[model samples]
Target chain A: MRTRSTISTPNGITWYYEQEGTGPDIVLVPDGLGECQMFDSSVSQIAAQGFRVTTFDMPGMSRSAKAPAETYTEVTAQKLASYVISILDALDIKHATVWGCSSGASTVVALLLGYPDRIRNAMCHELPTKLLDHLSNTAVLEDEEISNILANVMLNDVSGGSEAWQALGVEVHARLHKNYPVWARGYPRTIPPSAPVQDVEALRGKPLDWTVGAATPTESFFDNIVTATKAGVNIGLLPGMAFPYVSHPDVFAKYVVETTQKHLWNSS
Target chain B: MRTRSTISTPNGITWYYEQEGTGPDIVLVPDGLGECQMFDSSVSQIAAQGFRVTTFDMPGMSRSAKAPAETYTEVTAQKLASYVISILDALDIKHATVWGCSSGASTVVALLLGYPDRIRNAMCHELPTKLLDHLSNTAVLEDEEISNILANVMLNDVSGGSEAWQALGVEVHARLHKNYPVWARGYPRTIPPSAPVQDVEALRGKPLDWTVGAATPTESFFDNIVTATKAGVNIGLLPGMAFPYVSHPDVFAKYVVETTQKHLWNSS
Candidate 1:
């Protein structure tokens, strides 16, 4: 693994990142407070799967740079995309897969929809779809609920909790290594948190993972699913991993493995 | 102490601050990178010495409000003094003592020189005597020497290196807890890794509290240091500590405490 502590952006934002493994490049973009280092296990799994992995910290975060005048907001999506682009430019990668979850998934969508040429394939977990769905009546979710989500994200944004970060590291392995079961068991730090507030969009099927929450038939994810339903897309919902309650790990793992196998079939 | 965050400046800057303690108010201003939290320990000390303690995070730091287009140079001094004025205006304090060191000292000098009527007394250490003497020469220090200094100072700018930060916290206690003792510990973090390629001014006398490759002389404390010197101001150098070496805890504490005392006297 080759890791650099700081890289300054043209706008004066500094970011911290780590690159590792080899093969086709896979850039792991994490949610806010979810930094490059936290994806340690996932990067290793992808590397083992024959791909180069790169991850990074956001502005005003970790050991990266800070912006004196900038404030992080929803519109921050573009700046983030540009940062990933800069990384690719530096590494001379023509194209790469962006693997993300929640806010990271949102970032992936921004990249794919806004800069389609830059991204190849994408893998993402539950993302809040209400905000993405222009048609959804977001008023159904109380202001407190929205505030709660924003507050939690901002709290982590400020504190950078050690245990929470470690948990993320574990989930990284639990995520990618599931496709390679033999390596999955010995995967260090790959256990998901028992009560993490997962994104509410991952669960939306009949089988029900229970590790994810319920995705109502009229739910926003299903409604907004049109965006990523492109040809050759391997995207599908992880059963029971959405809002009403999370689904079982087994169910989600099944989906993950199945998705990986499909990719394997094409390559083989 | 009823403290609030995010006070807007007339110039559209957001300032964050805390106010409380007892006795006459002592506004503690820290240099850039050194936030208000750094004074958590010192505030109590000042309180013990009979004074209401007020401190703030420099603009663009932590929760304090930040203005657009803030530079580390003049903005710091201007905003800090302005922050003091704002705090006083907001709290209706007619006059108070100003205490500072390093960048804090920089703030004190600006406040004393700019608003002498508002300040009864002031105290500071290693105020970049050189920075003040040749204001335009900051460009020279920025060449290389200051870069190293910045790198060292930027160490705590994030969440990693907890062990190192823990050591720093302990050092803060051991050195500044009592009267600021010999500030040897602050050297590594303060001394610029190398001297500037340009021949900047040299420190000749006034007793060096910090010994970087070069020291900002007391002569540069202010343009009107002569008048202040003639008035017998209580500016004292920590016995053996000097800049770029002022990072030492003893030197740091001594200067901080001494400056606070000066502000307190002026308030009286």
Candidate 2:
């Protein structure tokens, strides 16, 4: 059973979170616009595998209050990195594996950059390091192209039911237009300034695992994942969009279990 | 005595807010780094004057938890308008006077733009609409000039206290770098596209009071407060920084009480 709880921040915003199962902790940071309810199936599978899984809504997304401008606008990969630590401290979890998909994955990279000692390992998928390039390109995208992308995400190809649209609406879209610029520019904090490659070699003691989507393999992963892999990081490929867990929860859970068992649990 | 409480949002983040006094409600949105504690003197004065005063940490600032990228980035004038309504609904306050200084003033302008029905009147001081121009000018500022300004805000002009430095730190600086582009561009939502004057003429039914500081007059008020005043919006002047309340709490509170009494309370 998933139990819901809330944690208070020094800044006056409370974070609503959920947890399930027991054993080594695994903190799951959801993608942008992702909610805890959307991860019900994946959390269940991971919990059933004997790992305590934790998830929460990011502020201003589903269930969180809007923070003040200064603090809210200050959110970056580094800020997210600090937030993960704050969450861990509030939950009283000493150390846990951190996993995030897409922007959430970017947070995982941020954690690796700023707080390696706090986590056993990190699993990140569909990381969007080229956000600046993406946003810069989005300007030239035809109105039809933008609509098609929005429709695909909201309708997911198959029609009927307002689940996706309800999850994300026009108001959210307007908000995204405002947020993208800040998020895109701040995202590069975890990546190298010269190249898109991340310097994970410094944290060789703390292993990393990168997962990329099949169809979305064009430029999603960090550029030098191959180099990191040769230097000992684990890399995996899955079939889907930015959200592999929602598309294939069972497979995602299995991959997580196997990866943790191989790189984290067995090593200890 | 003021009471502090927390409210959970539909988006999963909870906001901490403080309220006190009796009579007409007044929502006191703080400046960028303003906190419930920092406003203790001002809040008490306003509350004791027989008006309810409410304040909260903006997302990611002080007591507020860091919201997700979407919600945090959605910190525009329009979003603040909606947020004021949400805050009112949660507290069961049907109508309230809105007061803000600096970014808080920006929220007040947002309220005027979007939710005039819920407000009895508005009091905004040192609002920054030409933020891009202001920031662009800051680039040429001497390092010592920047440090002097930071020291005033962080140390409150007196030495030996870390509150200001703690509130506005390097992390906030990094976040500011990211937020500048988005906020600078998106800030003009309430202003007319071609005219520097706001479209508040459409909302003439709602009363507005604009306040600006003496030292901060270099671009403090919106470009058209003169026109706004001639068009029936009330305007005030004071001597201080963007946050007159912090520099002169008693005077600021007295000014707020006098303005509300004259503009809102005494009205038929």
Candidate 3:
């Protein structure tokens, strides 16, 4: 059975959330889209494997209310750090593994950096670390117009609709109408000219594993992963685009469970 | 059992989706928050009532990918018109009642206006009609600064987390970070200055039922509803904030089913 509800944070945000299955707790964060509906298939697959899954929509996206008017970007990561802790506290879960994809993956990295103690291990998929590292590489970022075209192409190849969208219907499209712009704005800002490089290095010697799509265009994050791995970050290659889980829910779920059992649990 | 899937549109977007229950078809379009997790409880309750529910994360949100970059806003309502038709076509759903809240509700209105042939009836919650009607009311819209604060406050009040977020977890928040900006941008733009007033007036003769929260700040759209009802549009009032559905799912679901039975099923 699945249960849905909301939690109020001291910061005054109301989060719409849900929990499923049973056993060890695992938290899945959404990527640029915000809401957890994208993970329905993957969460079901993971929960079926005996892990309790918890997910939610962030402020102003889907069910979660928007945050108070303020300069959010200044402390966006910090606010997220606190929000994660508050979620764990509210749920009464002492510790759990965490995972995210795309910008969500970057958020997991932020969580690992900010609240490592609360999470036993973390997994990130299609992290745009390379984009972060090369923000100033005018050669790569140089394609002001072409990159837009390519990014749009890549975005189109992956976006529009799927079985999930089909099942979920128009709300998904309605959400995209609003969310895509925020993604357009925030995704680039997430990797600022001055974003800390130390954060990437922090993944070293931590309980982290990163994966990316096999055929996803190289310019997106492949080079960044290669750079990170060269600097000692653990990288795993998967056969899909930015959202491998969307395309292969069971496969991704199995990887998560097996990874958790092998690394987080230390046994099969 | 619940199943997740995706559908590809000839327009080149792939919609990821999930489905529940069996019976007649009811499609859900999300409000600004985007993803369908907010509807989990209500979907379950609605599904139990013998309706096959289909919902998805819109492009740039959750599992559904971003659309190809192009001039999107001009024909947003029209695109949704086609998108909804595509969804119905893919699912083999010949006819269904459509429902949406806030922007989702606006979408319902758009669908009714654009593709009335495919839908039996429509239910819209907190449709932002005033904003749509008075696009030039800079007195209401003049608060470039205050609107930000109000929007943020509205977002936080709804976001933070809920039982749904608790179940879904941190990604909801993570998604918020990126999506809020898009929402911030897209929300106001949703009601462009040139949006036709004739369309809203058109709802008066259609199978449409609109609802609003009892105490929701009236400025955004309350007066618009009053104006519409004065002109003979069907309207219902619910006790809650802008989103009666989120705060009051059972009540809202009851209203939805009752509304469907009374208005949609019997035909106006």
Local distance difference test scores for all models: 0.45, 0.61, 0.62
**Model 3, span A1-268: residue lDDT tens:** 7878998767667788889989888998876667677777778888888889998886556677466533123224445556666777878878888887765676677777777777778888766543442322322333344345434533555532245334545676556555544444444554332222355456667788777665553334433444345446666666556666666667778888887776755524
Which tens-of-lDDT digit does each residue in A1-268 have in candidate 1? Answer: 6655566656666667777767766676765443455555555555565667777765544444364334233224445566668766766778776755555555665565556677665555544444323112222445445434434432343222334433444544333222122111111111122112232243322111111123222122332232223122233444332211012334432343344445446545
Residue-by-residue lDDT tens digits, candidate 3, B233-256: 666567556555566778878876
Best of the candidates, TM-score: 3
Question: What overall lDDT, based on C-alpha atoms, would model 3 receive against the true structure?
Answer: 0.62
Model 3 residue B225 lDDT?
Answer: 51
Off by over 4 Å in 1: A1-268, B1-4, B70-80, B129-149, B153-232, B239-268
lDDT of 1 by residue, B28-98 (tens): 67544545666665566556656777777655444543455442233445455666687568667787777
CAPRI class of candidate 3: incorrect
Count steric clashes of candidate 1: 51
**Model 2's DockQ score:** 0.01
lDDT of 2 by residue, B193-236 (tens): 22213665664655777766644322224233444444555555
